[PDB]
């Protein structure tokens, strides 16, 4: 679990969005596993606007943060799950690191701010849904 709170927006994994997220929907994209909902309270997370390929993510299944080198956002095949059929997930970045299904939503950050959230994993890999191209989150 986990979310990004920026301005009047909450960014979550689309497969973990709640009834309240869907009732306050702003934008969603199944191909990216992202959903953004509106909030009444002001969020103060900062979104990175950069091309960093190193950062630190929070891993809930270890209660720890890990440093990672990750690939640029790209179209990556993701095997079928209870939430989606087998498909290409877009804007996904992979890195070597520990992840379990419940780790989805953990934030990846670089020195500029939030980069994205955990969305995929298994086999000593961890995948992050990029949010740096969503310029409207702060303007
Ligand atoms: N974005 C998606 O389609 C995901 C939806 C939930 C299931 N998916 C995983 O990759 C889970 C996973 C397995 C093993 C280790 N870590 C994990 N995060 C795919
Ligand atoms: Zn950066």
If asked whether residues 35 and 61 sit together in one domain, one would say no
What tokens were used for 130?
């990029």
Which strands sit side by side in the sheet containing 4-13, from one edge to the other?
4-13, 34-44, 25-29
Solved how?
X-ray
Active-site hit among 15, 29, 65, 98: 15
C-alpha pair distances (Å), 1 with each of 11, 63, 73: 12, 13, 22
**Which value in Å is the resolution of this experimental model?**
1.3
Question: How far is it, in rounded angstroms, from Cα 116 to Cα 137?
Answer: 13
State if residue 103 touches ligand 1 by the CB under 6 angstroms criterion: yes
Is residue 52 part of an annotated ligand binding site?
yes
Question: How far is it, in rounded angstroms, from Cα 105 to Cα 122?
Answer: 15
Question: How far is it, in rounded angstroms, from Cα 32 to Cα 129?
Answer: 7
If asked whether residues 53 and 23 sit together in one domain, one would say no
Cα-atom radius of gyration of the chain, to the nearest Å?
14
Q: Is 15 a catalytic residue?
A: yes
If asked whether residues 92 and 31 sit together in one domain, one would say no
> Which residue has tokens 């990175």?
48
Nearest listed ligand to the Cα of residue 32: 1
If asked whether residues 107 and 70 sit together in one domain, one would say yes
C-alpha pair distances (Å), 112 with each of 15, 28, 31, 39, 53: 27, 25, 26, 24, 12
Q: Report yes or no: 78 and 87 within 8 Å, Cβ to Cβ.
A: yes
What are the residues facing 96 on neighbouring strands? 125
> Which residue range(s) make up the domain with 88?
45-139
If asked whether residues 100 and 73 sit together in one domain, one would say yes
> Which residue has tokens 């979104």?
47
C-alpha pair distances (Å), 69 with each of 6, 43, 62, 124, 128: 25, 28, 19, 13, 12
Q: Is 19 a catalytic residue?
A: no
């Amino acid at each position: 679990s986990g979310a990004i709170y920026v301005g009047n927006y909450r960014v979550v994994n689309r497969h973990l969005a709640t009834h309240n997220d869907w009732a306050n929907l702003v934008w969603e994209d199944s191909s990216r596993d992202l959903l953004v909902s509106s909030t009444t309270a002001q969020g103060c997370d900062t979104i990175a606007r950069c091309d960093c390929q190193t950062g630190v993510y929070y891993c809930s299944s270890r209660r720890k943060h890990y440093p990672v080198s990750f690939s640029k956002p790209s179209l990556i095949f993701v095997e079928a799950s209870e939430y989606y059929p087998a498909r290409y997930q877009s804007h996904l970045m992979l890195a070597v690191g520990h992840s379990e299904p419940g780790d989805c939503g953990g934030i990846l950050r670089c020195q500029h701010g939030v980069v994205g959230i955990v969305s995929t994993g298994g086999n000593g890999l961890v995948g992050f849904a990029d949010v740096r191209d969503l310029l409207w989150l702060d303007e």
